[PDB]
Amino acid sequence: ATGPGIVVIDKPAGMTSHDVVGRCRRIFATRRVGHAGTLDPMATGVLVIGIERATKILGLLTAAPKSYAATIRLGQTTSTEDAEGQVLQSVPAKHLTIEAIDAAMERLRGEILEARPIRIDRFELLAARRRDQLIDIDVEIDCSSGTYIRALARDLGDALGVGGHVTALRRTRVGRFELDQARSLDDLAERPALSLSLDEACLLMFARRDLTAAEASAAANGRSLPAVGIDGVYAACDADGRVIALLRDEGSRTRSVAVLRP
């Protein structure tokens, strides 16, 4: 009933990204639902959902930069590298200083089936608390993907010689979408609404090209148009501002990325 669009969800802890999609299928009374990239079950925070034909732009959202707030427990390793597993190795971290921790964090910035390059762009220390023999640190991580944040925490613990694991993980950003635009699933169930319509999401994210009636008919069929030198994927709109297709300029001709209004 809402039409196509995107919804920014604040995922609850423990829930899979698949099951969020499941709940949205029920909420929006449709089977055409997808997400723009998994968020770890133990994590909370930003998960971007597409409804109806907005599923066709999900791939353009998946490589977006991400930011996380995390807590790492120094002094203990666990079987899962998070607080859900049993403690395996336990040694006091009490000798560690802010200087030592911060320096080891700085050192872990950089680039880490086919092997994929994962960038840890930022690894910033916010706070540190003593918990008897252990140290809990609150951190912020900017990365291309959060898939190996557990490994990062383990690597930090390893670097400091005390071991580490993640006790809290919260995604604060996916591309343009932060937690201030995110709603809870109960909030969404109460009043089902999109964050943005598909038109709104494309016009926010991409460059824009207004098409004549002739160009608009050709775009709706996925046929090529003359290129105008636009840089990157762009929204090709009709006279009414409706986004017909997402295109890319390649030399003198366009190539269709996705047809949104066939």
Please report the domains of the chain, with CATH numbers, ordered by start residue: 5-197 (3.30.2350.10), 198-260 (2.30.130.10)
Active-site residue, from 10, 19, 40, 180 = 40
Whole-angstrom distance, CA of residue 187 vs CA of residue 173: 20
Specify which residues 140 forms β-bridges with.
Answer: 69, 124
Residue 48 has, within 13 A of its CA and on its CB side, a CA count of 25
| Secondary structure (DSSP) of 136-183 | EEEEEEEES--TTHHHHHHHHHHHHTS-EEEEEEEEEEETTEEGGG-B
Cβ proximity of 48 and 61 under 8 Å: yes
Cβ proximity of 75 and 39 under 8 Å: no
Chain breaks in the chain (C to N over 2.5 A) after: 112
Whole-angstrom distance, CA of residue 102 vs CA of residue 126: 10
CA 122, 126, 128 angle in degrees (round to 5)?
A: 125
Cβ proximity of 172 and 178 under 8 Å: yes
Specify which residues 137 forms β-bridges with.
Answer: 72, 128
Whole-angstrom distance, CA of residue 43 vs CA of residue 68: 10
Please give the biggest Cα pair distance in the chain. 72
Whole-angstrom distance, CA of residue 102 vs CA of residue 124: 8
The resolution, in Å, is 1.9
Whole-angstrom distance, CA of residue 108 vs CA of residue 154: 11
Catalytic residue check, 40: yes
**Do β-strands 44-51 and 164-174 pair in parallel, antiparallel, or remain unpaired?**
parallel
| Cα dihedral 44/175/128/105 (nearest 10) | 120
Token couple for 215: 């160009």
Beta-carbon contacts of residue 23 (< 8 Å; ≥ 6 apart): 185, 189
Q: Which secondary-structure segment (H or E) carries 67?
A: strand 66-74
CA 221, chain centre distance (Å): 31
**Whole-number Cα distances in Å, 231 to 18, 91, 198:** 34, 53, 21
Q: 19 phi and psi, to 5 degrees?
A: -75, -25
Q: 62 phi and psi, to 5 degrees?
A: -70, -30
Determination technique for this PDB entry? Answer: X-ray
Whole-angstrom distance, CA of residue 61 vs CA of residue 36: 6
